[PDB]
């Protein structure tokens, strides 16, 4: 039979799950400054946890933490967390143009005549780049939340066709389309620390130049055995339309972007003191800079 | 049993395969200069290997060899190559117009109101022409890579309807369409030499006026027995729209063109010296001129 | 149905295969200098890629790269390579002796009377040595290509029987025999760089003291989980024959050695620029020195 | 048929197995010094190989090596060893008390009236601690062999109930019970060196802060891929009994503890010299200090 003297055993490793969800408006043009070129593309870093745990303050559109992040921030920081899945779906595109003008007046923005204009989406699958800089080096987290920011992919690309000649992956987005991109985080470890407003924290992934760090008092755990499948962030630009006579149209578009992230947070132990054991297994996530773009290549 | 004194036999005729891929933007108008006529059409010489082995330099949009061609150029030149299949697919057409104007102002380019405008594509299947010249005789390889160039088909064709009355093959391309054209090269021989920037090198084909040349020290190998099926390059022009009262619209369009070519290159022999035997079987491909257009007719 | 706006996706990770083949003559004696001892043995480093990618210049018997290596050297260096399988087969042994002499004359070389003489082949399977030096420390790549070179295994081994008392693996080779030894390289990674004439580059293997290096900008990928099966190079010497009265015969032999290596080289990306992404995953192969011998022991 | 010239191949990697067995007496009290508190607990480090390879000298109860360890010490040190399984079984508890006293006299030790008193056994499964110190910092190996020693778990724990409120795992031991605890060592590697009298040598385990070291001339082999199941040592104290009026009983107990460890030792190679190859794969075991306690936490 049962042990009449069995003692209550405390739970170990139990956790909770929190889902983050939000919606945003994004606008895009041909990523040009004057005549079309192939120097920049808008970048959407889906791997940046910051884009999901933060939102915009209604009064000044500044970056502010979501109620959910705010309420579990302390627990995350101390006991650890994992990111299972996260992603975005862009849809409901609305094409725009600024080619109409009044006599002795300037061009004004309007809807487009038809639905022929489209957005171009790229991924560096052939291994062109390792590290890039934002066109503006003073970009803030708020800006990124407001919209994907421009990244210089080829400072010397006067030829606007460079992107379509170089990027391995390419697809178009037009009215009626739905474009979904997701990322699954590595779940072998628990990660510690908060997700600051100063630097992007990457959803746990291991490959190429990308790597997370070992615990303060513990061995590093990672996939050393083989090359993992690399994950690519996306780059975009409204397709730059040139006419047969060299005329360049002024087109752009606005889309709705729905975001989601599934977070799992570790619970504190039973008792009345903060433990210390987690120092042996809590890994430190990889981080970057608001004005930098790191592309993973495992092959 | 096996021969205890068998010696290692060296491989013979082994080769490697390289695929070339790229994407480009093309623009077209009614191929006119003032009032519509039927004198010129844009030509897309899919048989020109140069269009696949070269690309555009990002800094000045000049012709430059692709990394792939660059890395196998030497081997190709000396040991030989074959072209299996190559082609293009034009899609995502975006119709354009320059008929809108502001009071006391000129016409400006804009998207089109509807999707009714379309591109006309022709092939000389009935045997009208043998040799044509480009409208401009100083065209460069870079220009051809940038866009299909104009070719004079009927210097005396004041009547803009001449093309639709004369060309045996004709089809239209409009928004949503995909137009694919391919060519399969003759594979009975291996060909030598580089693909220069000065003159177009034709994908091996035999028929009519078109022919490749014999090896330096060897017999010519070709299909002498029968007439092969001729291959036609395409000619285009945005359909020239005239109104009931003689008004002529200013229409054009931009499309995306994806290119591919499958190349097979012969490997050098085992050992430490360049051989000489290939001189007996390496044929010389047919070549043309950047300002000329040769049409094949085997029947 | 299909997407009317699908774009061409570029190939990724495609590669080519190159096989290297050659034949050589090797000669061996009892590895002695005067009276027999057990200090040296000829070594055949099958793991040295240099032995397969290089050959001998016909004019001066110096080391020179094979046409095949020469034509892919640049691509290998920049985009990466792997070695699948490589090896040698020694056969057609011809026993020799220098025991016959003319009155008031010296000994002269001749064929042997019978086929009783034989070659001894060893492998250090019991873990005797880690690192050894060549008897002559000024050995060149050309010498190694010309013939297996002497390596000092026991500087204090006056007793010529030491090798047969110590080496764990041993087999004999005589007329009619075929002795094949192969090595399979690790294929989890791509490796960069050329194979110089100055230092031996090892076919990728991981174990014991042997290890390859991490990419410039990427994580190291290797089998950390377990001990791999170690690979042993071979050591030889014509069996030293002593008579009942201490007389020492002067025997040797010549064999034919056929070599082969299967190389796989990565192709450059589509486009007109050299990429940089490979810096994240191209590992650096292990290298040694022409006058050193490293033996692997994983158990 | 068989090769008439086949040579004897030497054995490789062969080994021998040695089992260690012993019995001891352990005594325990409430781990207090005056009034009950929750600052210390007796610790039994089953992972310390020293507890199995050493015993007590009959003349002075000092630590001395067992005949078995003594006879294989040299071989272990040089050629390597592994620990498969080891453990203890505590049984035959005899409860004690010192609450009886004579008029105008002090308390004297006696058996207990009934079998209600019991021992408490804990394991830090919830990750409370990483590193602890022994109550006395001058503890010797002999002391540990003589009995489990006190370790300070909470220097500020005046509240004697702290242990039962904090430790995740807890069970009781009373008359008639048998408490068995075992540990299985990692067997992927061979380990070298002796097991000194100065510092505890841990049975090979990898996880959290715990790790073994790489060979002198070889790659480190360990489970990097995932978090292993951590192993916990035990902590004890006779249950501190307080009466309804605050009276504190003086209880304790004595048990018999049977120990065992299965060791596998590698044999030297055939021949007449000590080899050197083992330097490439013999790992170095993790070690600690006689006055320290390291707790593993992999999650
Ligand atoms: Ca916005
Ligand atoms: Ca163009
Ligand atoms: Ca030779
Ligand atoms: Ca005792
Ligand atoms: Mg605009
Ligand atoms: Mg980044
Ligand atoms: Mg126009
Ligand atoms: Mg032509
Ligand atoms: Mg001789
Ligand atoms: Mg070596
Ligand atoms: Mg007592
Ligand atoms: Mg310890």
Task: Please tell me the experimental approach by which this structure was elucidated.
Answer: X-ray
Instruction: Provide the resolution (angstroms).
Output: 2.5
> What's the number of CA atoms in the CB half-sphere (13 Å) around residue B195?
33
Residue A3 domain flag: no
Residue D157 domain flag: yes
Instruction: Name the pairing type of β-strands C131-134 and C292-294.
Output: antiparallel
Residue D2 domain flag: no
Q: Which residue of A has its CA nearest to B105?
A: A103
Q: With 0-12 CB in 10 A as exposed, 13-18 as middle and 19+ as buried, what is C172?
A: middle
- Residue B224 CB contacts under 8 Å (≥ 6 apart), including other chains: none
Neighbours of ion ligand 7 (CB under 5 A): A 243; B 98, 250, 252
Confirm if B278 and B13 have CB atoms less than 8 A apart. no
Q: How far is CA B78 from the centre of its chain?
A: 24
Count H helices, E strands: chain C?
4, 16
Please give the DSSP secondary-structure letter assigned to residue A223: -
Spatial distance between the Cα atoms of C208 and D277, rounded to a whole number of angstroms: 9
| Closest ligand (CA of D110) | 11
Spatial distance between the Cα atoms of B200 and B203, rounded to a whole number of angstroms: 10
DSSP for C116-166? ---EEEEE--S---SEEEESSTT--HHHHHHSPEEEES-TT--STTHHHHH
> What's the number of CA atoms in the CB half-sphere (13 Å) around residue D47?
26
Nearest to C66 by CA among B197, A281, B272: B272
Confirm if C234 and C41 have CB atoms less than 8 A apart. no
Nearest to A81 by CA among A297, A281, A292: A281
Residue A67 domain flag: yes
Residue C3 domain flag: no
- From residue D93, give the alpha-carbon distance in Å to each of D25, D143, D249: 10, 21, 18
Q: Partners of D89 in the beta sheet?
A: D180, D258
Strand (E) or helix (H) holding B265: strand B251-266
Spatial distance between the Cα atoms of D194 and D78, rounded to a whole number of angstroms: 9
Residue ranges of B 88-107 with Cβ closer than 8 A to chain A: 92-96, 98, 100, 102-105
Strand (E) or helix (H) holding C111: strand C107-111
Spatial distance between the Cα atoms of C223 and D206, rounded to a whole number of angstroms: 17
Nearest to D14 by CA among C125, B220, C1, A275: C125
Q: With 0-12 CB in 10 A as exposed, 13-18 as middle and 19+ as buried, what is B295?
A: buried
Which tokens is A31 given?
């990523």
Instruction: Name the pairing type of β-strands B190-191 and B282-283.
Output: parallel
Spatial distance between the Cα atoms of C152 and C148, rounded to a whole number of angstroms: 13
CA angle C280, C286, C287 (to 5 degrees): 130
Spatial distance between the Cα atoms of B157 and B149, rounded to a whole number of angstroms: 18
Residue ranges of D 268-297 with Cβ closer than 8 A to chain C: 269-273, 275-281
Strand (E) or helix (H) holding B98: strand B81-101
* CB-CB neighbors (< 8 A) of C232 in chain D: none
Q: How far is CA A220 from the centre of its chain?
A: 25
Nearest to B34 by CA among B165, B162, B158: B158
- Residue A252 CA to ligand 5 center (angstroms) comes to 5
Find the CB nearest D172 among A5, A12, A280: A5
Q: Partners of A100 in the beta sheet?
A: A108
Whether D and C touch (3+ CB pairs < 8 Å), yes or no: yes
Spatial distance between the Cα atoms of D265 and D79, rounded to a whole number of angstroms: 8
Check C91 against B177: CB less than 8 A apart: no
The neighbours of chain B, by the rule of 3 or more Cβ pairs under 8 Å, are A, C
Residues in chain A: 299
Instruction: Name the pairing type of β-strands C282-283 and C190-191.
Output: parallel
Confirm if C107 and C252 have CB atoms less than 8 A apart. no
Spatial distance between the Cα atoms of D128 and D139, rounded to a whole number of angstroms: 24
Spatial distance between the Cα atoms of A120 and A234, rounded to a whole number of angstroms: 10
Confirm if C98 and C250 have CB atoms less than 8 A apart. yes
> What's the number of CA atoms in the CB half-sphere (13 Å) around residue C69?
22
- Give me the helices (H) in chain D, please: 50-53, 67-79, 141-146, 162-166
- Give me the helices (H) in B60-185, please: 67-79, 141-146, 162-166
Q: 């010397």: which residue's tokens?
A: A156
Report the number of distinct structural domains present in chain D. Answer: 1
Q: 């807890």: which residue's tokens?
A: D170
Instruction: Determine whether the annotation assigns residue A52 to a binding site.
Output: no
With H, G, I as helix, E, B as strand and everything else as coil, classify residue D76. Answer: helix
Confirm if D236 and D28 have CB atoms less than 8 A apart. yes
What is the SS3 string spanning A70-95? HHHHHHHHHHCEEEEEEEEEEEEEEE
Nearest to B37 by CA among B135, B117, B111, B130: B135
- Residue B82 CB contacts under 8 Å (≥ 6 apart), including other chains: B185, B187, B189, B190, B191, B204, B263, B264
Check C272 against A165: CB less than 8 A apart: yes
Please give the DSSP secondary-structure letter assigned to residue C53: H
Spatial distance between the Cα atoms of C15 and B292, rounded to a whole number of angstroms: 37
Nearest to B36 by CA among B202, B227, B238, B180: B238
Which tokens is B76 given?
């190709």
Confirm if B22 and A165 have CB atoms less than 8 A apart. yes
Nearest to B193 by CA among B79, B51, B89, B43: B79
Q: 């220009």: which residue's tokens?
A: B143
Confirm if A246 and A36 have CB atoms less than 8 A apart. no
Q: 């591919």: which residue's tokens?
A: B260
Cβ–Cβ contacts within 10 Å for residue C41, how many?
25
DSSP for C177-218? -EEEEEEE---SSEE-S---SSS-BB-S--BTTB--B--TTS
Work out the angle between the directed axes of helices B67-79 and C67-79 (0-180°, nearest 10).
180
Residue B158 domain flag: yes
Confirm if A125 and A135 have CB atoms less than 8 A apart. no
Which tokens is D227 given?
């978090």
Residue A168 near chain C (CB below 8 Å): yes
Question: D139-157 burial by CB neighbour count: b if 16+ within 10 A, else e?
Answer: bebbbbbbebbbbebbeeb
Spatial distance between the Cα atoms of B128 and B165, rounded to a whole number of angstroms: 12
Spatial distance between the Cα atoms of C257 and C179, rounded to a whole number of angstroms: 9
Whether B and D touch (3+ CB pairs < 8 Å), yes or no: no
- Residue A234 CA to ligand 5 center (angstroms) comes to 21
> What's the number of CA atoms in the CB half-sphere (13 Å) around residue B57?
8
Q: Which residue of B has its CA nearest to A171?
A: B92
Residue C144 domain flag: yes
Nearest to B44 by CA among B104, B87, B5, B91: B87
Q: Could you give the maximum distance between any two Cα atoms of chain C, in Å? A: 97
Spatial distance between the Cα atoms of A88 and A90, rounded to a whole number of angstroms: 6
Strand (E) or helix (H) holding C52: helix C50-53
Question: Edge to edge, what strands does the sheet with C131-134 contain?
Answer: C169-173, C119-123, C234-238, C40-44, C149-152, C131-134, C292-294
Instruction: Determine whether the annotation assigns residue D161 to a binding site.
Output: yes
With H, G, I as helix, E, B as strand and everything else as coil, classify residue D26. Answer: strand
Spatial distance between the Cα atoms of D36 and A236, rounded to a whole number of angstroms: 70
Which tokens is A118 given?
């489209």
Q: Partners of B105 in the beta sheet?
A: none
Residue B45 domain flag: yes
Spatial distance between the Cα atoms of D129 and D49, rounded to a whole number of angstroms: 22
* CB-CB neighbors (< 8 A) of C166 in chain D: 270-273
Residue span of the structural domain in which B96 resides: 12-299
- Residue C78 CB contacts under 8 Å (≥ 6 apart), including other chains: C192, C268, C274, C278
- Residue D251 CA to ligand 11 center (angstroms) comes to 5
The phi, psi pair for D87, rounded to 5°, reads: 175, -175
- Give me the helices (H) in B21-88, please: 50-53, 67-79
């Amino acid at each position: 039979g049962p042990d009449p003297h069995r003692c209550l055993q405390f739970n170990t490793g139990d956790s909770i799950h929190i889902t983050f969800q939000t919606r945003r408006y994004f606008e895009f043009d041909a990523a040009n400054d004057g005549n079309f070129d192939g120097k920049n593309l808008y970048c959407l870093p889906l791997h940046w946890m910051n884009l999901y745990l933060y939102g915009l303050k209604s009064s000044d559109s500044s970056a502010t933490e979501t109620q959910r992040y705010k309420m579990v921030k302390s627990m995350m920081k101390t006991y650890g967390w994992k990111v299972h899945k996260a992603g975005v779906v862009m849809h409901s595109m609305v094409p725009l143009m600024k080619d109409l003008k009044v006599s002795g007046g300037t061009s004004f923005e309007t809807l487009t005549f038809t639905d022929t204009p489209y957005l171009e989406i790229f991924k560096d699958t052939t291994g062109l780049h390792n590290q890039l800089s934002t066109k503006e080096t003073d970009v803030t987290l708020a800006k990124w939340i407001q919209n994907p920011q421009l990244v210089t992919v080829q400072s010397t690309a006067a030829n606007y066709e460079d992107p379509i000649q170089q990027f391995g992956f390419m697809e178009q987005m037009r009215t009626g389309d739905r474009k979904a991109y997701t990322i699954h985080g590595d779940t072998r470890n628990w990660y510690g620390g908060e997700i600051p407003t100063t630097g992007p924290t990457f959803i746990p992934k291991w490959g190429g130049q990308i790597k997370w760090d070992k615990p303060s008092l513990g061995n590093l755990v990672y996939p050393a055995d083989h090359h993992t499948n690399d994950w690519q962030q996306i780059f975009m630009r409204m397709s730059p339309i040139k006419g047969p006579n060299g005329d360049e149209l002024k087109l752009g578009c606005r889309v709705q972007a729905d975001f989601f992230l599934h977070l799992e947070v570790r619970l504190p132990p039973q008792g009345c003191v903060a433990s210390l054991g987690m120092l042996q297994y809590l890994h430190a996530p990889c981080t970057g800079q608001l004005n930098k773009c790191y592309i993973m290549h495992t092959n």
